[PDB]
Design a protein around this nucleic acid. Sequence first.
DNA 1: TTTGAAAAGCAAGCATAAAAGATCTAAACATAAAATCTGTA
DNA 2: TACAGATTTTATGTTTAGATCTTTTATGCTTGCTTTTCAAA
Lengths: 251, 226, 544, 85
Amino acid sequence: KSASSFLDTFEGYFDQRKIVRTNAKSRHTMSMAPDVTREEFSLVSNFFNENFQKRPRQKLFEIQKKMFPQYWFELTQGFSLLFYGVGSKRNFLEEFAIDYLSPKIAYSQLSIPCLILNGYNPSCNYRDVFKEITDLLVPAELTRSETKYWGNHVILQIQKMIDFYKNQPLDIKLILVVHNLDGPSIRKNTFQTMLSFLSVIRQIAIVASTDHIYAPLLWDNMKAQNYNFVFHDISNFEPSTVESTFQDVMK
Amino acid sequence: CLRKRIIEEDDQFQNVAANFIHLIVQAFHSYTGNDIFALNDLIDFKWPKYVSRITKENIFEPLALYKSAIKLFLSTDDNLDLSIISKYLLIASYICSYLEPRYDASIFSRKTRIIQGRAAYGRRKKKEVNPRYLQPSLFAIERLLAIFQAIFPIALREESLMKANIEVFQNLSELHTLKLIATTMNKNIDYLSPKVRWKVNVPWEIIKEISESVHFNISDYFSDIH
Amino acid sequence: ADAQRSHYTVYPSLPHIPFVKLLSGKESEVNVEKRWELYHQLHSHFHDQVDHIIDNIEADLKAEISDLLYSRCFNTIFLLGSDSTTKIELKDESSRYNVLIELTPKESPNVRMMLRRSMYKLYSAADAEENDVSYDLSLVENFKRLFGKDLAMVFNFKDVDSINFNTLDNFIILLKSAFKYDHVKISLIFNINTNLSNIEKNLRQSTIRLLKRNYHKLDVSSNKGFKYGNQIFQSFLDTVDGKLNLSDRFVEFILSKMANNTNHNLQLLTKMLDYSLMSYFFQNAFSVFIDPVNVDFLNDDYLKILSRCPTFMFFVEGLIKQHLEEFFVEFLVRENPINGHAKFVARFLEEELNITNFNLIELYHNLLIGKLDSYLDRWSACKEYKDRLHFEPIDTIFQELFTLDNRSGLLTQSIFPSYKSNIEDNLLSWEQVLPSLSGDLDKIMAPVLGQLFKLYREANMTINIYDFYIAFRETLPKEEILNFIRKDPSNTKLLELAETPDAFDKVALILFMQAIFAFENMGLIKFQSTKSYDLVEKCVWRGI
Amino acid sequence: SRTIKLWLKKDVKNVWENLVQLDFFTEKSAVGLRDNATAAFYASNYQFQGTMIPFDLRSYQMQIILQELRRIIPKSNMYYSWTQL
DNA sequence: TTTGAAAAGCAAGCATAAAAGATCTAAACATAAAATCTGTA
DNA sequence: TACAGATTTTATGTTTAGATCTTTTATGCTTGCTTTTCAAA
């Protein structure tokens, strides 16, 4: 515990950066910590992740499923959804965008394909994802004049899709789901530029989540315009057992 | 301009042009050095303003014509909107770069202590060298937000301090995009890494005019340190 | 497994309106249809005028660029507040090819690449307008010998506040060398979003003297005299007039949020107005009665919640102290002419008085709060019309069901949330997010992230992770952990690990390591050393 | 104090750029002209940190030192006493 | 009203993290002559 | 059968994006001595 006077605001920030004397520093490591193997960590972790606080999470998820028509109404008006909160938002976005959103859009326009991105995976790439966007939306290929002089073909092709899709009917052809938009390979500038120019296209629905507490530093005013986010807090204290396998936990 | 001036108001005009060129040379040779091109540019910029002050008294009098247009020979004259959050974030960035973090609590702290504890004592000495002359230091985001909240202008359910919402981080992202602030890396920058540090990227003459546009007293924070 | 991929396509197996039933599930479906349709007529009526305003913005800006461009040095144009999206077009003028060459900082790693891309664009345009060449400035030298026409080059430097200034300086010095050719004229367009002096002190003084021979300035930004904001808001006032009125707190919310955005405040204004209209047509059941033909569709719930108005409160209290459906349906005909009065004082303000540097949103806010006179006591040229332009708002009855107001805190949660503050408040006061319904364990012990955050908030510079784990153990109770860990006899590994005498410390270490790396992923905590992993630094503080 | 026109900071910038161009100052730890075209190409595809900071903070080193300036500036020059430290 | 004493401050030492960049290498982008395929005449 | 034309194979050049390693410089902890502001006589 800190021997502080303040805890909140800059008052607790400046007051908690004390220059602690070297005589009052404890030399404690993991050497006298308990020795734990991998399998018992996995067993205890899955047991509390499937039993501890499970009834309040189930109840709370039963409240926040009532927000699904409001989310759909936000998506039809051109707003991208960004979800944030404490805990895993993987299962929420899968259930909303698969069980609910695609059948509702498909029946209202008379299923809709759902690309699902895993930003917790460090090997998520913009060129592979855009080749699949090409595979799903079949855009027209760039002319020689449209390639300029060693330009990025992905960005120029998406800009050509932007000034193609402005005169198409405004109906959702693709639902594009981004788990963990602020993970390691997905937070970089080119991939965010790609999704901003994709979010300009009204005919693609953008559903994304973030996990980092400093994540809104990723977007300047142009990118914030292009995303056009409506923010929604979904805090549920989930396990996050899928993303945790992509980091090393035994270290 | 001279041909319109002499009808509105060859050798004598040649003497007038030569005297103007000699006056330009003696006024700005220390500025230009022995540069033909810079003096040519100065002659081009100052000749019509010199011609416009020629009257029927000044034309045959070099000293009177020089006294009519002396302000052309006293200054070189070689010269040619931003948000409140972004201005105050620039001021906080300049404070974070050019002041030490250990003396923050002696400058910005103002809260009444329920719990007993001494605050910072402040610095004993004054620096020999102005820190604003040197390179800026590198800071963290949380320190910048803390000083921004400490310097931003202002019951039971009000909480008049401004917290770091979407707009603060968005203005910070524009502030980096314009490179009014900079980082250690510029290519393939990871915004979310804790190892990435930030510095201010404006000189003192820019941050002074920005602080004059918002009536902030930034020079008070450097008058008592050096 | 799909969870271990990077990206995958799912086609869900399928077996019509997102609006829901209001009045506690008693709203009829025809009212839902009317709400959806009427929201769509209001939304379409707003965005048609928004689209015409936007095309007028680009058309007028193109006109003034073409005016400033065509009426031995560069023709320099400094576009302040550019946020470059303009598609500049040039004249189809005979005996001279006019080529627009656009350059970005991504296309500018050095001078050689800038020249090569410029000459490739020049040759491509000159071939498309009517043997291979070298992509250097000698193509500019021999342009009349290869195409028979003069050359007019207009360089559009996009996002000059991002380009390297030494490279741009050397490219301008390179372009100066084409001034010895009689068939070439060069225009430069610099797209600035910071200031003129910022680029003036990152260029050498000889280049500044070069650019000073022929230069013009022009403001581009969306807050140029407010007239493009003032149209759009009035378009909203041309959409909602006679239907709903704006609240003063909603208008000052608009003013504060547009004062916080520099380059793009028009689209932020449109987004806030759209989301307010969405919230109204999704929340209120009285929005069917905006159409004046639905007045026969009143029920008991509509009158039951109709009587709970502060205006109806004051009215019936006054009539009781003096001495329902027909009273309601007749009082829906008044027009609320504050919008017409605001448009009238605007057209009076730039009709003859030549006052054009005003914000119509400020005027409408001061007209709403009754302090209009304090608003027009600033210009000192309209002193003669303090009674001609005077207006007193009339507080009508039951207008609080027909209004756009910001009091529930919905706009500031959906459009501009306190993101990191919300994260740390849900971490620290978790009982707020989680229901208060492992029956004996959930009442006693918090979720591990919340307990770990409460121990985290009360710590210093450097946290020793072993002692922090001990502080996490002492919060946990051993007895009901050992009771609940034996409440599943199917898994025998859990029972035999529970039988071990070091079970509680081990389980606490499982939960502690899981929660620590949860905080490390979220960014709250940091290992300062790449190896060892014996100490941590706090990154974030609550309430900043 | 013991009258020379004191030039402003906005005018000494031109004199400073002339002094940099005349090889009197060099940028601190600058390689300069590379030996071969491959290293020069590699240097051309990289933006150095000196060209991104403002000009009044750039570090320079001297091509001539104060002792040589004292040696070859004449005695009757009125800035001569400043050549000693 | 003093007192003093633990909190704060300053400087030297030194191991170490990190900025800058030198050198290079893969990947996208790009062109091209000879051979091979291919759809008819 | 054959042939004009389209496509592939093999071969190389152009430009951008990122990795790795080295060298020099900021930084952060330690230790000893000096100031100093607020919890008790």
